[PDB]
Amino acid sequence: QKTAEQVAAERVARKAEKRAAILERNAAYQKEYETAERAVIDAKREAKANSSYYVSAEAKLVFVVRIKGINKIPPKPRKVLQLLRLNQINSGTFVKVTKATSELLKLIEPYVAYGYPSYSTVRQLVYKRGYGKINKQRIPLSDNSIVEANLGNYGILSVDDLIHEIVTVGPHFKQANNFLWPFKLSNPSGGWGVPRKFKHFIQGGSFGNREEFINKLVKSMN
Amino acid sequence: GKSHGYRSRTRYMFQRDFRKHGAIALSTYMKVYKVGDIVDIKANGSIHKGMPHKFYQGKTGVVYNVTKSSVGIIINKMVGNRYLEKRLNLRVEHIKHSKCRQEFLERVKSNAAKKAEAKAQGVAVQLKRQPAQPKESRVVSTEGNVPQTLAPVPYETF
Amino acid sequence: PTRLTKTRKHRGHVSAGKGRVGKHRKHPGGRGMAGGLHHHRTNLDKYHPGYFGKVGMRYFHKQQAHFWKPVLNLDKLWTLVPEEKREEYLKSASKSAAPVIDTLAAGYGKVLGKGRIPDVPVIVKARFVSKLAEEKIKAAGGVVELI
Amino acid sequence: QKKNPLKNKQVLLRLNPYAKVFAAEKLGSKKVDQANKIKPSATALETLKH
Amino acid sequence: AISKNLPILKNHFRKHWQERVKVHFDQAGKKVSRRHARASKAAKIAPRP
Amino acid sequence: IDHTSKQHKRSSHRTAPKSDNVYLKLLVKLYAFLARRTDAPFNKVILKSLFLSKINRPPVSVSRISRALKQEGAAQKTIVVVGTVTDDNRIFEFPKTTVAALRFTAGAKAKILKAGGEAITLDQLAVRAPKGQNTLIVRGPRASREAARHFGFGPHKGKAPRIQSTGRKFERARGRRRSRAFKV
Amino acid sequence: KSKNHTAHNQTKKAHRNGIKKPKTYKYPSLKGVDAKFRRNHRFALHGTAKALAAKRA
Amino acid sequence: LHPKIVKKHTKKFKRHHSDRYHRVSENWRKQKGIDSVVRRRFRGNISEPTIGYGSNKKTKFMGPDGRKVVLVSNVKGLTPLLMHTKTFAAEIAHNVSSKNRIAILAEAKKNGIKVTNAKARL
RNA sequence: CGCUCAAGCGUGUUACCUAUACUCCACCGUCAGGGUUAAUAUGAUGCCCUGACGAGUAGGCAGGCGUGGAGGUCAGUGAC
RNA sequence: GUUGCUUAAUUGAACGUGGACAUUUGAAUGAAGAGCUUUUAGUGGGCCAUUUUUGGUAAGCAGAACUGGCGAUGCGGGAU
RNA sequence: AGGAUUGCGACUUUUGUCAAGGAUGCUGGCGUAAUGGUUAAAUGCCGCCCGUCUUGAAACACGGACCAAGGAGUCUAACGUCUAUGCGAGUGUUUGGGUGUAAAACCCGUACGCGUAAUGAAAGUGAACGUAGGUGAGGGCCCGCAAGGGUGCAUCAUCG
Secondary structure, three states: OOOHHHHHHHHHHHHHHHHHHHHHHHHHHHHHHHHHHHHHHHHHHHHHHOOEEEEOOOOOEEEEEEOOOOOOOOHHHHHHHHHOOOOOOOEOOOEEOOHHHHHHHHHOOOOEEEEOOOOOHHHHHHHHOOEEEOOOOEEEOOOOHHHHHHOOOOOOOOHHHHHHHHHHOOOOHHHHHHHEOOOEOOOOOOOOOOOOOOOOOOOOOOOEEEEOOHHHHHHHHO | OOOOOOOOOOOOOOOOOOOOOOOOOOHHHHOOOOOOOEEEEOOOOOOOOOOOOHHHOOOEEEEEEEOOOEEEEEEEEEEOOEEEEEEEEEEOOOEEEOOOOHHHHHHHHHHHHHHHHHOOOOOOOOOOOOOOOOOOOEEEEOOOOOOOOOOOOOOOOO | OOOOOHHHHOEOEOOOOOOOOOOOOOOOOOOOOOOOOOOOHHHHHOOOOOOOOOOOOOOOOOOOOOOOOOOEEOOOHHHHOOOOOOHHHHOOOOOOOOOOEEHHHHOOOEEEOOOOOOOOOOOEEEOEEOHHHHHHHHHHOOOEEEO | OOOOOOOOOHHHHHOOOOHHHHHHHOOOOOOOOOOOOOOOOOOHHHHHHO | OOOOOOOOOOOOOOOOOHHHOOOOOOHHHHHHHHHHHHHHHHHHHOOOO | OOOOOOOOOOOOOOOOOOOOOHHHHHHHHHHHHHHHHOOOHHHHHHHHHHOOOOOOOOOEEHHHHHHHHOOOOOOOOEEEEOOEEEOOOOOOOOOOOEEEEOEEOHHHHHHHHHHOOEEEEHHHHHHHOOOOOOEEEEOOOOOOOOOHHHOOOOOOOOOOOOOOOOOOOOOOOOOOOOOOOOOO | OOOOOOOOOOHHHHHHHOOOOOOOOOOOOOOOOOHHHHHHHHHHHHHHHHHHHHHOO | OOOOOOOOOOOOOOOOOOOOOOOOOOOOOOOOOOOOHHHHOOOOOOOOOOHHHOOOOOOOOOOOOOOEEEEEOOOHHHHHHOOOOOOEEEEEOOOOOHHHHHHHHHHHHHHOOOEOOOOOOO
16 A cells, blocks of 8 residues: 555566576576587597597487377377377477487387477477466466576576576476476478378488487477 | 196296206205295295295295295285285295395495595585486597498398 | 156156166066075175074074063163252262162163273162172172162 | 567567677677688598598 | 165065055044044033043 | 376365255355465364265264363363264263364253353354464264274175174074085 | 187276275284294283383383 | 457257158257267268357347347336346337337336337337 | 370479368367455355366266146236 | 293394484386275177287188277268 | 556656557448348259167168157155254154144154164173273374474274
8 A cells, every 4th residue: 555656666676686687697608508519619620630530429308299199009109108298299398318218219209200409499499389387277488487486496597597407408407397388389381391201200201310300390380 | 628727837837947856955945034025936846845826936025924944925916907915825945035125225325325425525425326328429549440441242142 | 856856857868777788678687586596696695694594493482571681881870860969979978878779660671881980889779780790889889789 | 468589579578688689799690710720631531532 | 686785675565465555544534533522422421530 | 189187077075065054154154264364274174074964074972072181281272073062971070171063962061061161153263263273173983883884895804784683594594604604 | 609708908997997006004914924923922012011111100 | 349249150950850751840859869960970961059159258148239138017127127228128028918018118218228129019 | 084205104302282180369168276345235156367178879967948736926917 | 122932042033112314205207186985877799900820722701819999980081 | 359557578868658468540431221130042062861779771671651639767665875954872743642723733741663782503691901002104283483392083004
């Protein structure tokens, strides 16, 4: 009633402090990605001069997409799709790559297409089709006040800070990835680049591992 | 008529071994069993008393009772759509110790040492088991290790 | 109420809650306990036991009169005395003035031990008595008269 | 009505305050780089060409 | 014929029971006949109980 | 769509009372207001118990109330029953106490108020204690009912068979003893 | 003329309702255990009740 | 600014074989068949009534006027609709006599309440 | 139907057509999770907010529409 | 500590009294709430497909094994 | 779509302004059969005859020429689980008596049924060592700023 009018001036001043903290952190994460790309490119040139071959580090993060629809799916691969949250046709997640998680993908390889994303495709998915799980309830990520309220205990005080954990694969990937609701994608705008969809990427079809070409397929669906 | 005896379809299971017939070594009898130990079951063709039914070959269970020549072992089995508790009474000749629990006790002592040691020095332990991670980047030297150019061979008749 | 039943709700559907295959015929099993030893053994082995056979010996011209004797626990005992005469009696009876409790007039045969009565002399009258029932009364102070 | 950060721009600037500094300095371009050495090889072109 | 987990009943209705049914509708009317009979007897006898 | 769980599932709990009583639903409205507002665990428990059926609300004997007072450090707590409070004639020294319940019997009214107690109803309790401070909830015995003994009958459960009457010549001989075939 | 036996839609029925574990409890059921052991075990628990009663004083 | 009404499905749900056989009336009745195609939904057949065809909650029980109709049999029955002219319209019953319609129509036009019928025989 | 450097057979590379499937918005119903008479007119069974889901014979439960009589109530309608 | 068990025994075995060690609740992933009780319907003629497979020359023949369908199911394609 | 305001922001030297928690502004024609509604025919594409037993029906499987009215899980004696109501160690007026504005409504109480004790074939006997016993779990309340401790109904397991 009274003094709550004066709080309108006060409460705005504390959010001006938080925006400065977001700006400096976003500048720091920009400096991490630019140095990461330049260090790998120059390291190849270092090795090539000394009659040696630089082998790149294996992918720490992989993105999966449900290709096959429902019904006529055996029980063992149907159970694994249920664990990876690909219940509907055209669904995303992100998977932290380990030896254990790789064996799950072997079981369900006919029904999914997957590959290694980059800091570009991940940025578009979290903005355009990003949704958070907040006491059940598929709630959108419109403002960054929502992300701080739930995931304030593990750092992650912004939308880009959540993106940082997914790309770099930090210590709180398990909490941050489970917070996100699976990405309900549309069908691709151009197409699949094939006559038939169920034959494996290397023979002709769509499913299985495609490494670098998953980035092209998702941006059309995004 | 159909045959459903006690030792039905037990031609190879209770068959003894190749060059291990006759008497049993004395270490089988010397082993101790307290109420709590986990044990795997193996039937022995020579010893006919206190012999297990074919279903329990390769099963594992906890000991609940001990007596003169035998040990009581409870085994859970599947039937219909519901697990049931069952009580067996097998002699010492069939039973041996399980090595599954063995590795767990090694992990308990090592974690206690790492927590006690590192807290007065390191201030960082990392005691949860890590799954097999992917590779890190490296450089391979080609000095005295030049790549050998291969090619697919043509077809021949042996 | 005829409107609330489910036969009103079934108007429209063909079978009326009885299936198309089973048909609802007259008497498919039998007529009351039929084939107890043959094809309703699985029902009677479960749920009932002891059904067939005959234990014990016969009693010709039995009367529910010889076998009477309604019991009375020591928990109840004081309920036979009136409500007005209770707060008076519980506080100081102290012999030569104990409240007489005739159990047979109320309608009880055997005075019987269960509860733990307070330390007051009682003087009870009854037909039959238990061995434990007498020990509890003598511990308080009173006695048991037979009739 | 959920807007979209990629379009609209005021919703973009509601998130990522760095969007001013990114767009002003042109980091989706950044000149960038460098002589000193166009810095060569040794015996890689023999195995590669063959 | 039998079978759930119900108590075994004993219903003795295998004879022509419907032919030999009685319903006491007369209870109320028959009471007034007795009160009338007790009153009219006292009028005849007069001074005696 | 791969439905993991069942769709359009019900809550599997009594939301409101099945009874159409006017005075009971007034009592529900008071505690339903408090449970949302107060944030005191006491109020959410009493809200549940008002919705329960006659079987789920058994009678609490006055001797059962006297036992809870002998607890070490619980002499002056307001004992809140949610049901009926019956009189018991297996006890004498009933202490000076305060009780809260839906109903009290004619006998139990005299036994409490003779000692100098306070037979209170749940609305009068709510005036004194909104949050429920220095209280002690008591619940009567569920599984001592005549229907409870017959549930889950079979070999070799140790339960009572459903029968009318009574002793011998009635479910004794074959299948209940070794002399006549077997003992179940 | 009639079909004899099959196991079709049998495991599929079982996984609808459950396929459950047998619960487990602390203090398991002491049945089918040596009688000589149990008699001495009763006297041990009777004697130790006297010990703890005397301590609380 | 009052929400514009959209009726979804204006065509009447007729019963199957209503036109074919005379005894089957046009009142709707669900097919309980096993060979039936109306139950199973085949391409190029009649539609069935379903909850998806239901009208909007903002504009339910409203005519072209945007008013919920109330049945009136006398002058005393007009007293609920005095301060509710825009929301509630009236309609006079069939069983009312000719002279009593003039009594209701007179006092109805005073307060500015719109009657659907009347008109009024003439 | 007609087709012959095909409108045939094997292989490659692009565009284009299109399902009640996928993405987005409107409305209906069902289920769940909340917020509220703190005098504050009209249904606390109220008045709002947020999220998900929708095929179905045998079968089960829920909420409604109509017919013939009985108790109450609109001092209901009617030879105009 | 406990005893009528067991020991050549002041041993052992069961069930304990008090004590030390919670970031690092000591693999991964998911969790749609978890566990439990009563009561009663319909059903108890099945059939087809991809692999495994017995009888038979073989069958749109007979008979089993593991998942998925039809029966209970429309919609786009295989002319039907 | 929504229908006072509240939020996040941006551009501002400042006031304020704005594409920022869902369309406002300006203009013309007609004001009625013109827009819509039902109804009949024509044109494009699609559509086998219902009910029934069956693994399977448009079927060369059965019933159906057509219309009107009638036409099929009812009532009772013993009962089981669940639910509402009244009283609660008790409960049940109504066989019967008293009254009456007369098959109603109202009032009365000896008995008697079930419950409060079981187990045995029967003769019969007949439920507190201890705070009505310990151990593990337990909602809620109590002490405390918290960490944690105390007290622990229902119920489940377990040994006496």
